[PDB]
Amino acid sequence: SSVPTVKLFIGGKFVESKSDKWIDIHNSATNEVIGRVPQATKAEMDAAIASCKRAFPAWADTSVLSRQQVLLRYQQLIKENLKEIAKLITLEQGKTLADAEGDVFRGLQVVEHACSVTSLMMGDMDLYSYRLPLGVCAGIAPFNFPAMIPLWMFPMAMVCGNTFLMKPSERVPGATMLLAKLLQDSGAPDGTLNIIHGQHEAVNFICDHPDIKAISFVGSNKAGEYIFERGSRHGKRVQANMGAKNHGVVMPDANKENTLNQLVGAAFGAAGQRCMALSTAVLVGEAKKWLPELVEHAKNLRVNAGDQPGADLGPLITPQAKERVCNLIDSGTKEGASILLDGRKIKVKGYENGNFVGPTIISNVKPNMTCYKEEIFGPVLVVLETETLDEAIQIVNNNPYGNGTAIFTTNGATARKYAHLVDVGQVGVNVPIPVPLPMFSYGKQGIQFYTQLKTITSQWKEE
Amino acid sequence: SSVPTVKLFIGGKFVESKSDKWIDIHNSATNEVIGRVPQATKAEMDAAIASCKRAFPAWADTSVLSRQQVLLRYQQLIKENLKEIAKLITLEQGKTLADAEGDVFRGLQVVEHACSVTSLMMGETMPSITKDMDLYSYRLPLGVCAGIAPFNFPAMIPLWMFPMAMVCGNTFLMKPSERVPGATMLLAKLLQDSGAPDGTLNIIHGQHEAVNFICDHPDIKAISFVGSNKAGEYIFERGSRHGKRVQANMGAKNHGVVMPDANKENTLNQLVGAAFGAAGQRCMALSTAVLVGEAKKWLPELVEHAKNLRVNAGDQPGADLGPLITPQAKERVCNLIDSGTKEGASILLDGRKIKVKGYENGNFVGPTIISNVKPNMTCYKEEIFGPVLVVLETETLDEAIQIVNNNPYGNGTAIFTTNGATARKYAHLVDVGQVGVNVPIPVPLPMFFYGKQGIQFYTQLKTITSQWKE
Numbered sequence A: 001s002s003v004p005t006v007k008l009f010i011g012g013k014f015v016e017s018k019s020d021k022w023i024d025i026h027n028s029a030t031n032e033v034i035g036r037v038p039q040a041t042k043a044e045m046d047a048a049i050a051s052c053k054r055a056f057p058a059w060a061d062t063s064v065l066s067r068q069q070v071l072l073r074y075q076q077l078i079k080e081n082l083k084e085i086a087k088l089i090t091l092e093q094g095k096t097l098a099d100a101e102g103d104v105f106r107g108l109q110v111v112e113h114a115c116s117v118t119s120l121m122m123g124d125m126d127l128y129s130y131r132l133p134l135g136v137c138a139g140i141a142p143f144n145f146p147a148m149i150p151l152w153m154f155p156m157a158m159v160c161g162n163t164f165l166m167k168p169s170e171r172v173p174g175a176t177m178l179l180a181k182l183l184q185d186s187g188a189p190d191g192t193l194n195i196i197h198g199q200h201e202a203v204n205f206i207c208d209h210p211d212i213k214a215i216s217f218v219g220s221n222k223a224g225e226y227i228f229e230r231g232s233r234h235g236k237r238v239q240a241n242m243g244a245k246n247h248g249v250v251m252p253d254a255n256k257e258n259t260l261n262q263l264v265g266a267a268f269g270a271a272g273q274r275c276m277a278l279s280t281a282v283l284v285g286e287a288k289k290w291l292p293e294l295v296e297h298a299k300n301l302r303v304n305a306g307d308q309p310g311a312d313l314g315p316l317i318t319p320q321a322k323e324r325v326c327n328l329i330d331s332g333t334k335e336g337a338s339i340l341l342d343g344r345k346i347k348v349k350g351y352e353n354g355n356f357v358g359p360t361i362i363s364n365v366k367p368n369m370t371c372y373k374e375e376i377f378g379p380v381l382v383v384l385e386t387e388t389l390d391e392a393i394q395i396v397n398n399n400p401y402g403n404g405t406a407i408f409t410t411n412g413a414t415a416r417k418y419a420h421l422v423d424v425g426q427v428g429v430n431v432p433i434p435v436p437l438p439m440f441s442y443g444k445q446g447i448q449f450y451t452q453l454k455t456i457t458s459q460w461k462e463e
Numbered sequence B: 001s002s003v004p005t006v007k008l009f010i011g012g013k014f015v016e017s018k019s020d021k022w023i024d025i026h027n028s029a030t031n032e033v034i035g036r037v038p039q040a041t042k043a044e045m046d047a048a049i050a051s052c053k054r055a056f057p058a059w060a061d062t063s064v065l066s067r068q069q070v071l072l073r074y075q076q077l078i079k080e081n082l083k084e085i086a087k088l089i090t091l092e093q094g095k096t097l098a099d100a101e102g103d104v105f106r107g108l109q110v111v112e113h114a115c116s117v118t119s120l121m122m123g124e125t126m127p128s129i130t131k132d133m134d135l136y137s138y139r140l141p142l143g144v145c146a147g148i149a150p151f152n153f154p155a156m157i158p159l160w161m162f163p164m165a166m167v168c169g170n171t172f173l174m175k176p177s178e179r180v181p182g183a184t185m186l187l188a189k190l191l192q193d194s195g196a197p198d199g200t201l202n203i204i205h206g207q208h209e210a211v212n213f214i215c216d217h218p219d220i221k222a223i224s225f226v227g228s229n230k231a232g233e234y235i236f237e238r239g240s241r242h243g244k245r246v247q248a249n250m251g252a253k254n255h256g257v258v259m260p261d262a263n264k265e266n267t268l269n270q271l272v273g274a275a276f277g278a279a280g281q282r283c284m285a286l287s288t289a290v291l292v293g294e295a296k297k298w299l300p301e302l303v304e305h306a307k308n309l310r311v312n313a314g315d316q317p318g319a320d321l322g323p324l325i326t327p328q329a330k331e332r333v334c335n336l337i338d339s340g341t342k343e344g345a346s347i348l349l350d351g352r353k354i355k356v357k358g359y360e361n362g363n364f365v366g367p368t369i370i371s372n373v374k375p376n377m378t379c380y381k382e383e384i385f386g387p388v389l390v391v392l393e394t395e396t397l398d399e400a401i402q403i404v405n406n407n408p409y410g411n412g413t414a415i416f417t418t419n420g421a422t423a424r425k426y427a428h429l430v431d432v433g434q435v436g437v438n439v440p441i442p443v444p445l446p447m448f449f450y451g452k453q454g455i456q457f458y459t460q461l462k463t464i465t466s467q468w469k470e
Helices: A042-061 A064-080 A082-092 A097-116 A149-159 A173-185 A200-208 A221-233 A256-267 A285-300 A319-334 A389-398 A412-421 A444-449 B042-061 B064-080 B082-092 B097-115 B156-167 B182-193 B208-216 B229-242 B264-275 B295-307 B327-342 B397-405 B420-429 B451-457
Strands: A022-026 A033-038 A136-140 A163-167 A193-195 A212-219 A237-242 A247-250 A280-284 A338-343 A358-363 A380-386 A404-408 A426-429 B022-026 B033-038 B125-130 B133-141 B144-148 B171-175 B201-203 B220-226 B245-249 B255-258 B288-292 B347-349 B368-373 B388-394 B413-416 B435-437 B459-466
Touching: A033 A082, A033 A173, A042 A136, A042 A163, A042 A193, A042 A200, A064 A082, A064 A097, A064 A149, A064 A173, A082 A097, A082 A173, A097 A149, A136 A149, A136 A200, A149 A163, A149 A173, A149 A212, A163 A200, A173 A193, A200 A212, A200 A221, A212 A221, A221 A237, A237 A444, A247 A256, A247 A389, A256 A285, A280 A285, A280 A389, A285 A338, A285 A358, A285 A380, A319 A338, A319 A358, A319 A380, A380 A389, A389 A412, A404 A412, A412 A426, A412 B459, B033 B082, B042 B133, B042 B144, B042 B171, B042 B201, B042 B208, B064 B082, B064 B097, B064 B156, B064 B182, B082 B097, B082 B182, B097 B156, B144 B156, B144 B208, B156 B171, B156 B182, B156 B220, B156 B451, B171 B208, B182 B201, B208 B220, B208 B229, B220 B229, B229 B245, B255 B264, B255 B397, B264 B295, B288 B295, B288 B397, B295 B347, B295 B368, B295 B388, B327 B347, B327 B368, B327 B388, B388 B397, B397 B420, B413 B420, B420 B435, B451 B459
Parallel strands: A136 A163, A136 A212, A163 A193, A212 A237, A247 A280, A247 A404, A280 A380, A358 A380, A404 A426, A426 B459, B144 B171, B144 B220, B171 B201, B220 B245, B255 B288, B255 B413, B288 B388, B368 B388, B413 B435
Antiparallel strands: A022 A033, A338 A358, B022 B033, B125 B133, B133 B459, B347 B368
């Protein structure tokens, strides 16, 4: 009758929430409610913070080797229960089983990397370089890679000696809850990790509470800047990889078939619901003639539920995103954007009630049009036209923000020129996704962030 | 005389400043005008930025080995021109010859350290991560950089700041202090003599308007500043607004703690040398001290030692502390001492009425020791920036640690004791990164700037993923 509720995580126990506000988790494949996520109340969040504070000293006093072994056990458990995580992802977010498994494998690789770190966490002029932890940390997850967000923050935040208070995606909490259950089963001390669900109000609380020494967030630029400002206001550490559009340049000498295939796979893969999604492209020179074949390749994609075989792309997380992308495409058409493929009114047999949206391609887009300004975060690929490499480079640089940029070409001179003159953190050559996840502002940067330094100097020979 | 002006340095020529607004440089020992520093106009700053941008590409494409050679020749010239820089510093800033010598010595040491960033500038690569797929990262300069130094350390701070941006491949626009630009001009001349490509370094002089320009201009990528807390916070906020990365040392407050189980004579000597050292004008000055236990009964010995300090001009011998930076600084120090006295703090030692024979016109202020200070008093909250020592009375180490923690912009302190457990307790409880043990100043080298961290700051990473399959 009543769908199950999403439990919290305080003091090493999945306690139930007393809040009255509940959000229904609608299955993106059929819009069927499959869960209920509550909004953490003030008392619940205060108890979570108290548990994190009480666990901080004990967890920190332990040696780096104990935390390393705990994280190794957690990684082993994840590897054992990878199929469960994949099924939970395909159920909640509707992502394909293959893409979910790949995401879980990437998260496991990130965890392993976090484990491979050496004793670096420790670090008459007797001097020391003790790098002590910060304290109670927190994190906010977007709707792109919810199951993987905790796998980025928990390993480093813990091995560094800090307690974490996670804010998972209220619309995809199952994956994070399963990951936390596995972590607890790994043998970690009770109270080391805590989890609370909520909305913008919860983000405000987290950014306002003083005990929160650091916070990490990824997603839209608006929320990113908002969290950055509200955190810097309270004088606490903040780091966020702002989501941005990626521009995939295509030279005429590049491999036409392979380039088109990779573009159609990256842009429309998982309905473009990736922060590294290649939502934009630039056809240089004769590449303009590839629009018909690009549309054909896009059509060749097989739309189907994430749990069914042969599913190349899944539906949108929520119907609100479908309405948003529809309105964006309508505005683009009104402004004069020449659309070539329209998958908005797609009716997937057996799942018409879902948020499925077929591949969409748009050409003749200009930098001043809303299509180039607003982030689609959907199965839409806006195509631009240029006459020379310099034009494409300038167009890509004009973008206010960008995480990754790809250029398909076989000439080494052109590739090097593009990679050197471009102002993007990550540059890919013949690869639409330079890195599976945004590394540009973690690894070394994460170690430097989640820790501090005390240069204890002493000249104590006389006494 | 005509009070020779401080000409600018744009491109490969020391172009004269056409600005109408000028500031007269006064000698702190006699308050006599010795020079006129210009207030760079919009056109001059635009020309300097254009020169920096035009020089950037050639300096970046140049091999790092050539930049290291240039820095080596510059350090050699500094070694040769040590005495000249020391004399210019003693003249303008008013410090003692020994102070300027040590300043240039630390600058040269940091330059030498930076000269060995060759291995650090090298990138990394992983061959064949996937079939016919490779990965490699390139470290590249940020672009054009800027520097804003305080009235203290006109040679050490630039020598710590700009050479890193140079070796990293960036162009630097140094904004020297409004009060002591001569040393910076001499350093720039020496650098130009080192064979550095013209246009790589540019210097402009001006008031807060210059800082506003440097922070507002978009071409500027990174900005560095050292000095007071207010100016540092303002510059950091403006850079964050305009997107400029700013690294600033604003926690200039420093506290000293002395336990009864410590070397009395040596601790007192070190405190007297650090607090009143160079008239206590340096940012990282130990102008605050917390006396615990028998330190209260030792305070008389501290005053006796402070009385031994000979207030005399730097040019003359026996100079332990020189005159203040400006007469307004002396007025402010006197006002702060008077406020502390009115607030009930006993002035165990007074130096306001000091009169150096032959240099009364200067801004000389003798050692001042203030006791009975409390957290609610102004002398504790306000930064003195002078030869004044505020002494707060506490009973246990916990009280001193709490007093230190009450000052968040206090990233610097030291503890004097003999027990290792006490030192560990002080290091842990105190929320300060630079914690010293039986040392007056905890490694004057400040940071949020230099070393490998400096390279990371003045450089960026570009992850390149290339798969030349076919």
